[PDB]
Amino acid sequence: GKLTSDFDNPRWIGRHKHMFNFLDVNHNGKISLDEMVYKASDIVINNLGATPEQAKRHKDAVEAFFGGAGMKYGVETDWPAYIEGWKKLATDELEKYAKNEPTLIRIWGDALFDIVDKDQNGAITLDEWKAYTKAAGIIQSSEDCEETFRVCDIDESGQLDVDEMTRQHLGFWYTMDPACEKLYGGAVP
Ligand SMILES: O=C1c2cc(-c3ccc(O)cc3)cc(Cc3ccccc3)c2C[C@@H]1Cc1ccc(O)cc1
């Protein structure tokens, strides 16, 4: 694995700058925690049929995750404060990884996969991953969705679970692990 940060890597900055511009759908140069939690909850409730119990769990997880990057309700976060807050989020997540503490990215996955998995067993199929990532907009083509199941160590079903995805997300969002490249296909650089 890799438990060292790489915040000076221009491709780490560019990866999250891509995400920031993807999240700033109204081209305001700034995004709020209200917008992020709305987008997240809108997906699982209105596209994926989450129950109120599932949605509340998922809401607290998304709220914590983006809140870990310094975003707050009623506050607009511009790009400089965004990437600065994302360094603090990656640092806190890397401390949790090292302490074998439940990370914010795992807690979001567990809450999300309970919705995305129709059997609610913490493992999603390729069609279910295409359903979520296209509703979220983070992936547009079915080709990029298939790259996820190539990069990830899929089980024998074969489905993707939170254990494997948390491992991939460690290297993709936090440490720039070369083996975690193309986790979202070509949709996210
Ligand atoms: O990990 C994930 C991630 C990271 C970012 C991101 C990335 C970098 C940024 O700088 C900003 C936003 C953005 C997204 C899309 C999204 C944004 C806001 C509201 C709902 C979805 C997603 C999904 C996906 C959910 C997930 C979580 C854990 C799992 O185990 C499996 C799936």
Author numbering: 1 to 189
Anything the authors wrote about it?
The Ca2+-binding photoprotein aequorin is a complex of apoAequorin (apoprotein) and (S)-2-peroxycoelenterazine. apoAequorin, which consists of 189 amino acid residues, can be regenerated to aequorin by incubation with coelenterazine and O2, both in vivo and in vitro. The chiral deaza-analogs of (S)-daCTZ and (S)-HM-daCTZ selectively inhibited the regeneration step to aequorin by binding the catalytic site of coelenterazine in the apoAequorin molecule. The crystal structures of the apoAequorin complexes with (S)-daCTZ and (S)-HM-daCTZ were determined, suggesting that the hydroxy moiety at the C6-hydroxyphenyl group and the carbonyl moiety of the imidazopyrazinone ring in coelenterazine are essential to bind the apoAequorin molecule through hydrogen bonding.
